[PDB]
Amino acid sequence: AKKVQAYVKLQVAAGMANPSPPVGPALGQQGVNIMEFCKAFNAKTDSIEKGLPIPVVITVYADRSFTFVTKTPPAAVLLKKAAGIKSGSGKPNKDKVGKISRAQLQEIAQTKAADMTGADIEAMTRSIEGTARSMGLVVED
Amino acid sequence: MKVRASVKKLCRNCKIVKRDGVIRVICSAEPKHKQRQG
Amino acid sequence: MLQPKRTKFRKMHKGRNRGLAQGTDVSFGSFGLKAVGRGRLTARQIEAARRAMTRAVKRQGKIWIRVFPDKPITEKPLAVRMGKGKGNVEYWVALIQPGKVLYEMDGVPEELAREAFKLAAAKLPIKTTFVTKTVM
Amino acid sequence: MFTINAEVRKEQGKGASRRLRAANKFPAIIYGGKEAPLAIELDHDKVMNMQAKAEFYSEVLTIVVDGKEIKVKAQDVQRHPYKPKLQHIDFVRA
Amino acid sequence: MALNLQDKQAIVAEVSEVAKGALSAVVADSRGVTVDKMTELRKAGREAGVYMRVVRNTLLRRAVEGTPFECLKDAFVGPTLIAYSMEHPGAAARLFKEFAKANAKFEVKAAAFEGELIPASQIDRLATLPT
Amino acid sequence: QLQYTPQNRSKDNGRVVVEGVGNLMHHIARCCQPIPGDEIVGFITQGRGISVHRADCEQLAELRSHAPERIVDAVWGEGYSLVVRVVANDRSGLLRDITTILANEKVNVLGVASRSDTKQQLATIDMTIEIYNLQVLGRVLGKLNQVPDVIDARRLH
RNA sequence: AGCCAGGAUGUUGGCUUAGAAGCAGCCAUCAUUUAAAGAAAGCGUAAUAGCUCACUGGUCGAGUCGGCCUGCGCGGAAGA
């Protein structure tokens, strides 16, 4: 479809949406209906799970009309998810906060397996582990 | 333009030049860097 | 500054600065800023250097100061007729022979030592040269 | 592996020594074990580059002189007060 | 980069796969995009793990000293940039046409590879994708 | 002259609920100046009420070395007072810079036990305050931390 | 040395914050595809995006780049 003439990501959570302040400009500077953004973000997330920030590649075609494809929930999102945490380390790698057994780093990997570069799925996990470390987490896998 | 006794690069886009023997740090960026003497 | 507290005498002969100082080889730290030319150092110069050397590397790292002033230097009050007794020690100094390593440094990457020492050297009246701690 | 060429010194006076040092070569001495200590004039620069390496001040070294290869060690050195160049060397006839 | 044998870590790796090097195809990719071979190395990294891996290194000092082994027609393949078309899992197969898929998709183009005679076809896209 | 009802605030109690009961006369320990941070395991002194000693600290540990059975834990009930310290670069007003941020500060800045000395630029401040919520501090620290001269903002035990 | 291209993904790393998405500040700094691409060297925003470097792949056709010790100069240099 049309490339990127008004294409950016986003950071709301679950099916939740609507405001301009956090990311309304993503459409606010575009002109596309922010309420169409609400109901339609739910056109995908009417079934999508809570408090796990899922970005949507806005897809406003080279002629105003659009579509969109959310990313499967982010790795950082699925770490706030798998760790039993709500936020990242108070101070990186020098401390931990929540565990993520690698079967989950892999399941999340199989979420990204259709939404990220790869060949070695446990290697995708290696990315999710560096992700786990950078953000500082109980590294247990 | 500076005319002080030091003169040496003031970024990198600054450049050494020896016109008439006199050293002049020309700068293809900041006009200010331009100087002389050395 | 860095004047010596107490002394056997409050004044001292001008003296001579010939010779090559013993404080040569690096001792404590990882580098050092060995002296090159010859000359004397007012204590305040040492302080001007220490700061404009310390601040150069923030509080990280470590700095030894191999030399000490101690030599008194008098001066005749302004517009004073000759003789009439020795002047008054306005300030202290250190006779510096070539090779008398001054600020030995340690704890930081070599490039930084070159960085700071270049500065403090700028403060100093005598020419200088960076030096790396040596194996025997 | 470390190896140098050298010379039996002619005159050993401070003067001849000094100018010899000006001649890009400098006096060195070797002693130990038994032999009467031998004056060792030797080229500077080669030794200079050779010494930079820390190993030079610990390992066994081989010194040439008329074909003979004494295997001394670096016992000590006296450098120039404010210049990179050396000045004199002391060798334990390891 | 690194000494001769280290650049031979490269050339001997290449040649090691040249042993499987049957079908031949090349191109000077002085212009392309990360996205296409991102999806293509993703392709080799999907449909069959690792095959015809292309750690492109095209010197008239590499392909040339990588030529002696097999695909002798690589003698006139080295100057300018060079793509690596290598057979292994389904020899003399679509491995070429995959870059036809990339062809229509901004790599400038696969630029009509002359192809060589090891399996059969050259400049033309193969007509035998196994029954 | 800006110099405590907080001496009657512990009397207002609720600052502690030892092992499952409140009121208990206790107090801040000068060693680990506790605040509603990582717990507290108050020691029982023979007199003068409980000696709350934050939680985990040599003294709190050495009493273990003695007769530990005297020591017991405590939640917190419902966050008053604290002593804090920040290091700086000599002065030249870099202390006045603290004093400037001190001017910015809203909480009662009691003990202003400033210090520096050393052979140089090492400078400090033994400030004491009535800070409330734990989060409010880092904020001041952050406000202290805009000035790089404020080389080390932190609470001290 | 110039010129062509790429310069990514996890991911908008975390903490923080109104905001950090390379670049508020404090730390991680691995992993994936890797030809190669720093959880980013510079610019840049409200965060964005954008533009350029590192680095890597094409070209090209030979040395070339950075230091050291030194010989002679140059700049710094204005009076009745």
UniProtKB/Swiss-Prot annotation, chain A:
The modification N,N,N-trimethylalanine is found at A1. InterPro entries: Ribosomal_uL11, Ribosomal_uL11_bac-typ, Ribosomal_uL11_C, Ribosomal_uL11_C_sf, Ribosomal_uL11_CS, Ribosomal_uL11_N, Ribosomal_uL11_N_sf. Keywords: Methylation, Ribonucleoprotein, Ribosomal protein, RNA-binding, rRNA-binding. The gene is rplK. GO terms for molecular function: large ribosomal subunit rRNA binding; rRNA binding; structural constituent of ribosome. It comes from Escherichia coli (strain K12). Part of the ribosomal stalk of the 50S ribosomal subunit. Interacts with L10 and the large rRNA to form the base of the stalk. L10 forms an elongated spine to which 2 L12 dimers bind in a sequential fashion forming a pentameric L10(L12)2(L12)2 complex. Belongs to the universal ribosomal protein uL11 family. The modification N6-succinyllysine is found at K71, K80. The keyword Ribonucleoprotein applies. Transmembrane segments: none annotated. Forms part of the ribosomal stalk which helps the ribosome interact with GTP-bound translation factors. GO terms for cellular component: cytoplasm; cytosol; cytosolic large ribosomal subunit. It holds the Pfam family Ribosomal_L11. The keyword Cell membrane does not apply. GO terms for biological process: cytoplasmic translation; ribosomal large subunit assembly; stringent response; translation; translational termination. HAMAP family: Ribosomal_uL11. This is Large ribosomal subunit protein uL11. SMART domains: RL11. It comes from the Bacteria. The modification N6,N6,N6-trimethyllysine is found at K3, K39.
Curated annotation (Swiss-Prot), chain D:
Gene3D superfamilies: Ribosomal Protein L25, Chain P (2.40.240.10). SUPFAM superfamilies: Ribosomal protein L25-like. Keywords: Ribonucleoprotein, Ribosomal protein, RNA-binding, rRNA-binding. GO terms for biological process: cytoplasmic translation; negative regulation of translation; response to radiation; ribosomal large subunit assembly; translation. InterPro entries: Rbsml_bL25/Gln-tRNA_synth_N (IPR020056), Ribosomal_bL25/Gln-tRNA_synth (IPR011035), Ribosomal_bL25_short (IPR020055), Ribosomal_L25_dom (IPR029751), Ribosomal_uL5_bac-type (IPR020930). One of its GO terms (molecular function) is 5S rRNA binding. One of its GO terms (cellular component) is cytoplasm. Part of the 50S ribosomal subunit; part of the 5S rRNA/L5/L18/L25 subcomplex. Contacts the 5S rRNA. NCBIfam families: PRK05943.1. Belongs to the bacterial ribosomal protein bL25 family. This is one of the proteins that binds to the 5S RNA in the ribosome where it forms part of the central protuberance. Binds to the 5S rRNA independently of L5 and L18. Not required for binding of the 5S rRNA/L5/L18 subcomplex to 23S rRNA. This is Large ribosomal subunit protein bL25.
From Swiss-Prot, chain E:
Keywords: Acetylation, Repressor, Ribonucleoprotein, Ribosomal protein, RNA-binding, rRNA-binding, Translation regulation. The modification N6-acetyllysine is found at K37, K105. The keyword Acetylation applies. GO terms for biological process: cytoplasmic translation; negative regulation of translation; translation. GO terms for molecular function: large ribosomal subunit rRNA binding; ribosome binding; structural constituent of ribosome. GO terms for cellular component: cytoplasm; cytosol; cytosolic large ribosomal subunit; large ribosomal subunit. Part of the ribosomal stalk of the 50S ribosomal subunit. The N-terminus interacts with L11 and the large rRNA to form the base of the stalk. The C-terminus forms an elongated spine to which 2 L12 dimers bind in a sequential fashion forming a pentameric L10(L12)(L12)2 complex. Two L12 dimers associate with a copy of L10 to form a very strong complex (called L8). Ribosomal protein L8 appears to be an aggregate of ribosomal proteins L7/L12 and L10. Forms part of the ribosomal stalk, playing a central role in the interaction of the ribosome with GTP-bound translation factors. Belongs to the universal ribosomal protein uL10 family. This is Large ribosomal subunit protein uL10. It comes from Escherichia coli (strain K12). The chain holds residues 1 to 131 of 165 of the full protein.
UniProtKB/Swiss-Prot annotation, chain F:
Disruption phenotype: A slight increase in biofilm formation in a csrA-disrupted background; when combined with a spoT disruption (a ppGpp0 mutant) there is a very large increase in biofilm formation. The ppGpp0 mutant makes decreased levels of CsrA and its inhibitory small RNAs (sRNA) CsrB and CsrC. Deletion of relA alone decreases persister cell formation in a hipA7 mutant; the double relA/spoT deletion obviates persister cell formation. It comes from the Bacteria. Residues 83-157 form the ACT domain. In eubacteria ppGpp (guanosine 3'-diphosphate 5'-diphosphate) is a mediator of the stringent response which coordinates a variety of cellular activities in response to changes in nutritional abundance. This enzyme catalyzes the formation of pppGpp which is then hydrolyzed to form ppGpp. The second messengers ppGpp and c-di-GMP together control biofilm formation in response to translational stress; ppGpp represses biofilm formation while c-di-GMP induces it. Belongs to the RelA/SpoT family. This is GTP pyrophosphokinase. It comes from Escherichia coli (strain K12). The chain holds residues 579 to 742 of 744 of the full protein.
